[PDB]
Amino acid sequence: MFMINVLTLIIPILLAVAFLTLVERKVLGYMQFRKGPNVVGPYGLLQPIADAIKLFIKEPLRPATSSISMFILAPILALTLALTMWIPLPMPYPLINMNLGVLFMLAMSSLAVYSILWSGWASNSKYALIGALRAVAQTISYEVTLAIILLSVLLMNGSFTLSTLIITQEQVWLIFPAWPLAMMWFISTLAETNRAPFDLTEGESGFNVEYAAGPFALFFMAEYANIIMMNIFTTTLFLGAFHNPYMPELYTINFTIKSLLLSITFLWIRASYPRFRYDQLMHLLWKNFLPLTLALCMWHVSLPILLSSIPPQT
């Protein structure tokens, strides 16, 4: 009975990321005065199926890897931490109701970089190793800023429970008292998933270029699942919906619409700006984002004390 719940959680994730590839192509194309795929299916609805069947019957590369264990294990960890990370999400009721769901998601965010590191190490090309090192550094820096922003927002919330965020946002959204934290959180989640304008491996090498068509597809599925879930996390954290305990479908429809709009905003940001340099995004974090994060952390530590606005523990 519970395995039915697990399957109905994990199979729509794969369907959603395939049609997210389709939606990305269509929305990106319509924003630059052309169309997306509309030939393969009716309005291109059969495009992800054709792409999947094409990618699963292509000849594997078989690179001359130094180690085969890390080469196998990097997609394993990537897909596992992409799919495990969806379970404490309160939509409006979570699959696993946990006391420290935010800390759980932050722990898997910190743990997800080993796929990049092992993919960079397993490839025999040292240029791929350099690219993997740069991607790892970017991910851990924005992990730091994600942790501080999450700490301040939860200090407004008062507990690490993810379902309590619906209760604390019943009157007004948290984007109204925490819009600088909202903006910086959105940019940090953009830079976490190697999303434009923070991707580097596409510009002048990639860490996962040596993988076959299948493992590259699995890395793509993991990355796009991370993108969708991060948008859902931003929706739950800052733009919470009205929840009726007798009609959960109202909350489901509302936050689904909001997270769809946020994912469309991700694709919209992808097609508007040039790429950052590596040192420029390091400058953006360590010299611009971090001082404001520390200042707003002090402000949100002191603000409930001076306003008699301390939230309950339970």
Partner 1 sequence: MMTYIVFILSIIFVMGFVGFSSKPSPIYGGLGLIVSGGVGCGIVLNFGGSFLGLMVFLIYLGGMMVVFGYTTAMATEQYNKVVLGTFITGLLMEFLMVYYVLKDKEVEIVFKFNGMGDWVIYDTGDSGFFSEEAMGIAALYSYGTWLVIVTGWSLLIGVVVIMEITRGN
Partner 2 sequence: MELLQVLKRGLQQVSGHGGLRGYLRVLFRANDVRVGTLVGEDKYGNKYYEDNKQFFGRHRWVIYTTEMNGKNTFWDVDGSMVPPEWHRWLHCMTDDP
Partner 3 sequence: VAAFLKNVWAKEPVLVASFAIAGLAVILPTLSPYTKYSLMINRATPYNYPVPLRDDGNMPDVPSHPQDPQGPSLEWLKRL
Residues at the site binding partner 1, with contacts judged by CB under 8 A: 66-67, 69-70, 73, 99-100, 103-104, 106-111, 113-114, 117-118, 120-121, 124, 129, 132-133, 136, 140, 143, 313-314
Of 120, 181, 129, the closest CA to residue 155 belongs to: 181
Q: For partner 3, give the closer residue by CB, 16 or 303.
A: 303
**Contact call for residue 50 and partner 2 (CB under 8 A):** no
Residue 282 as a binder of partner 3 (CB under 8 A): the answer is no
Span 69-108, contacts to partner 2 by CB under 8 A: none
- At residue 69, the 3 state secondary structure works out as helix
Which lies closer to partner 2 via its Cβ, residue 42 or residue 245?
42
Write the CB contacts of 255 (distance below 8 Å, at least 6 apart in sequence).
Answer: 91, 232, 235, 236, 239, 240, 241
230 is a site residue for partner 3 (CB under 8 A): no
User: Which residue in the set 6, 15, 39, 96 belongs to the binding site for partner 2 (CB under 8 A)?
Assistant: 39
What torsion do the CA atoms of 52, 54, 58, 62 make, to the nearest 10 degrees?
-30
* Cβ pair 23, 267 in contact under 8 A: yes
Residue 103 binding result from partner 2, partner 3, partner 1, none, given CB thresholds of 5 to 8 Å by partner type: partner 1
Check binding of 146 to partner 3 (CB under 8 A). no
Query: Which of 7, 50, 247, 295 touches partner 3 (CB under 8 A)?
Result: 295
8 Å CB contact between 157 and 164: yes
Binding partner of residue 42 among partner 3, partner 1, partner 2, none, CB cut-off 5 to 8 Å per kind: partner 2
Query: Residue 244 forms beta bridges with which residues?
Result: 247
Q: How far apart are CA 171 and CA 76, in angstroms?
A: 42
